[PDB]
Amino acid sequence: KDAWEIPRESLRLEVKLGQGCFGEVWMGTWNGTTRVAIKTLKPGTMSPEAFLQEAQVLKKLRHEKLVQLYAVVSEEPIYIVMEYMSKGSLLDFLKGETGKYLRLPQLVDMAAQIASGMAYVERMNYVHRDLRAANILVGENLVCKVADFGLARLIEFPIKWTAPEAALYGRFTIKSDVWSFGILLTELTTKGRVPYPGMVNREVLDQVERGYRMPCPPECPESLHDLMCQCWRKEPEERPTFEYLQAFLEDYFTSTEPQYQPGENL
Numbered sequence: 001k002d003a004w005e006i007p008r009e010s011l012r013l014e015v016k017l018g019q020g021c022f023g024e025v026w027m028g029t030w031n032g033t034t035r036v037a038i039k040t041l042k043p044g045t046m047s048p049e050a051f052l053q054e055a056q057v058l059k060k061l062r063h064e065k066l067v068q069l070y071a072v073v074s075e076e077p078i079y080i081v082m083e084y085m086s087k088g089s090l091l092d093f094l095k096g097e098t099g100k101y102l103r104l105p106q107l108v109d110m111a112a113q114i115a116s117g118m119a120y121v122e123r124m125n126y127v128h129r130d131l132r133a134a135n136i137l138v139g140e141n142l143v144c145k146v147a148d149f150g151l152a153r154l155i156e157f158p159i160k161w162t163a164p165e166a167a168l169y170g171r172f173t174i175k176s177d178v179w180s181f182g183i184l185l186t187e188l189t190t191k192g193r194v195p196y197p198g199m200v201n202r203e204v205l206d207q208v209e210r211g212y213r214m215p216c217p218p219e220c221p222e223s224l225h226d227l228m229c230q231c232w233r234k235e236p237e238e239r240p241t242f243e244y245l246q247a248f249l250e251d252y253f254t255s256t257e258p259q260y261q262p263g264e265n266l
């Protein structure tokens with residue numbers, strides 16, 4: 001046991017937020033004062049330090065644009081205790097009521113924050129393995145954080161967000177996260193629309209290997225789709241860094257699209 005462990009008696013499992021093939025997610029209260037969120041094991045569901053190795057990644061990672069670990073439980077019943085994100089998933093946020101008021105400036109800045117989280121990941125020498133809008137939590141003031149490193153690792157599988165070399169040959173790198181970041185960029189600019197519309201997994205895998213790439217989403221600037229294309233380069237090592245992507249997006253509206261005017265959607 002380590003210093004990340006707490007008494008479970010500390011924990012008010014209150015409202016329910018979701019389920020899965022893993023367990024649940026709950027709003028709750030920690031030591032009576034603190035709002036938290038808990039990813040649960042409903043008793044047996046799966047392996048101990050499989051559920052509890054997303055902790056071992058999340059313990060050593062610690063950035064403002066990453067969802068924060070608060071504590072863990074193995075005094076079974078079992079829990080992963082984390083920082084509570086008020087507006088839920090970026091996917092739900094984009095599809096929901098506020099989604100449609102979202103404009104490029106907002107969307108680019110969300111992209112930015114995420115780039116920022118991932119750039120930290122990048123210099124910590126970790127890989128996320130599952131980057132996509134569904135694993136981005138939104139809080140107040142349009143804040144976005146990376147969450148659910150649930151497969152993550154030191155650099156020692158829903159394929160539409162997955163880089164070819166990673167889906168096919170299991171080559172997961174920060175460079176394959178980048179690939180996913182570019183796909184994540186199509187989600188933001190379409191307001192949550194599933195990538196590769198009308199295509200099934202195997203068809204996506206076959207067309208992407210022949211070099212098919214998603215075209216510029218409607219009302220999305222060419223400069224922003226260029227960036228997605230860079231993120232989707234065949235050779236992993238030619239994809240840009242999260243550091244370049246972070247700085248590119250923060251500076252976007254001055255350095256890159258300094259003449260942008262809003263349309264009916266973006």
Ligand SMILES: COc1cc(Nc2c(C#N)cnc3cc(OCCCN4CCN(C)CC4)c(OC)cc23)c(Cl)cc1Cl
Pocket residue numbers: 017018025037038039054067080081082083084085086087088089092134135136137147148149150
């Ligand atoms: C702890 O373990 C993990 C937990 C999570 N999941 C969450 C964490 C975290 N972290 C924090 N806070 C969350 C808040 C949620 O909903 C709150 C508000 C929802 N509404 C949207 C619609 N409007 C109009 C009302 C508000 C939520 O919904 C499912 C999931 C959350 C992930 Cl993604 C990964 C890991 Cl590893």
